[PDB]
Amino acid sequence: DEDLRFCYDILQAVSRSFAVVIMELDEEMRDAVCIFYLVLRALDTVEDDMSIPVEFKLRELPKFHEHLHDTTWCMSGVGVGRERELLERYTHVTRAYSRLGKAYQDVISGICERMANGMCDFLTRKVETKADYDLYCHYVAGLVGHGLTLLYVSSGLEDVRLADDLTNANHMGLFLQKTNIIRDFYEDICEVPPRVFWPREIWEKYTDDLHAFKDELHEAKAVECLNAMVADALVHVPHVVEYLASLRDPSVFAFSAIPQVMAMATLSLVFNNKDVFHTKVKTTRGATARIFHYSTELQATLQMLKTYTLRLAARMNAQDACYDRIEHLVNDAIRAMESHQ
Numbered sequence: 001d002e003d004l005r006f007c008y009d010i011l012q013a014v015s016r017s018f019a020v021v022i023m024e025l026d027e028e029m030r031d032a033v034c035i036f037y038l039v040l041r042a043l044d045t046v047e048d049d050m051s052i053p054v055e056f057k058l059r060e061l062p063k064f065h066e067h068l069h070d071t072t073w074c075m076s077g078v079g080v081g082r083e084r085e086l087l088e089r090y091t092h093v094t095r096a097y098s099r100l101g102k103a104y105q106d107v108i109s110g111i112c113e114r115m116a117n118g119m120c121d122f123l124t125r126k127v128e129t130k131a132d133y134d135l136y137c138h139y140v141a142g143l144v145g146h147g148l149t150l151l152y153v154s155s156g157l158e159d160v161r162l163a164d165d166l167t168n169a170n171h172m173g174l175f176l177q178k179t180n181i182i183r184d185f186y187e188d189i190c191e192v193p194p195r196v197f198w199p200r201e202i203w204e205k206y207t208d209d210l211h212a213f214k215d216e217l218h219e220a221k222a223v224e225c226l227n228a229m230v231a232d233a234l235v236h237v238p239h240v241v242e243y244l245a246s247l248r249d250p251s252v253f254a255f256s257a258i259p260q261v262m263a264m265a266t267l268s269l270v271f272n273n274k275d276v277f278h279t280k281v282k283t284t285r286g287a288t289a290r291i292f293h294y295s296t297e298l299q300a301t302l303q304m305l306k307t308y309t310l311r312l313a314a315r316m317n318a319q320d321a322c323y324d325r326i327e328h329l330v331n332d333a334i335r336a337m338e339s340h341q
């Protein structure tokens, strides 16, 4: 089982966040989800390496899923740090993969291919529209939501009805991806080349140059745009509440709930916060421990989400050009929560 051990070891190095939450899952589901994550993590590593040619990515990505059945395949000159190691010693992942149930392998192979092609689409173009924003989030996060949902059903832990309509699963992925895209604006725009995800359709209403938000000079417009991004992410909350409330298994529930509650805490902190444009805004380690502790069942999770949702709303004024748009979004979220209390 050295292969699985490497997997969990690389997981811990490549992503401390997920590597903690994944431990909420029972061993069998956990192995499948851990391997699933590393496969996608490998894709991400190819998509994000800006020192390697795009034609190289459009070439390798589409057939990434095919390598899942080739225990000798690996990549040598891509990525930084442990990610690089993930690809070079990618054998451990494919081996572990070959020892998974037939149904788990197919979900993983299926999501891997669709995400890869989606990444290819956006490797050759920008995110101009809100539609673009949403679709890109779908490919790199919404699909993880689909995949996980299909792994839950396939495992037997959740009812087959869960996979009927995957819309809410996609919403779950979008809420997480969007909160991170919002939180990581500065860090992303400060890289070489600069990484940009905020959709032009949204930011062109406050500026002609996104890079202007880095200057205190345009602090007001940056914050108004930041607030419009938050409003856009809040659209997903009522759906996150529905998906979480449809879960019956405690392991699946905690694994699914924790990241969502963390996202809402981050979102409540970045909202109307100009610090977002010069540093990473993060929750305290104590709030994190508390979230991990209580998000084991629906009721407590709903109240923590309500609490954070109420903190977000409390942070604004009738002066802000969002107060209107944010208010009904907060009410929809809180309403959806009380709808299960």
Ligand SMILES: CC(C)=CCC/C(C)=C/CC/C(C)=C/CSP(=O)(O)OP(=O)(O)O
Pocket (backbone or CB within 6 Å): 014, 015, 016, 017, 018, 019, 140, 141, 142, 144, 145, 146, 148, 149, 168, 169, 170, 172, 173, 176, 177, 180, 256, 259
């Ligand atoms: C359960 C369900 C239906 C949907 C959830 C969808 C999921 C799990 C999406 C993962 C997408 C994100 C935000 C990845 C960043 S890697 P990271 O999480 O390791 O670490 P970081 O964001 O850098 O802190």
Ligand SMILES: [Mg+2]
Pocket (backbone or CB within 6 Å): 044, 047, 048
């Ligand atoms: Mg990426």
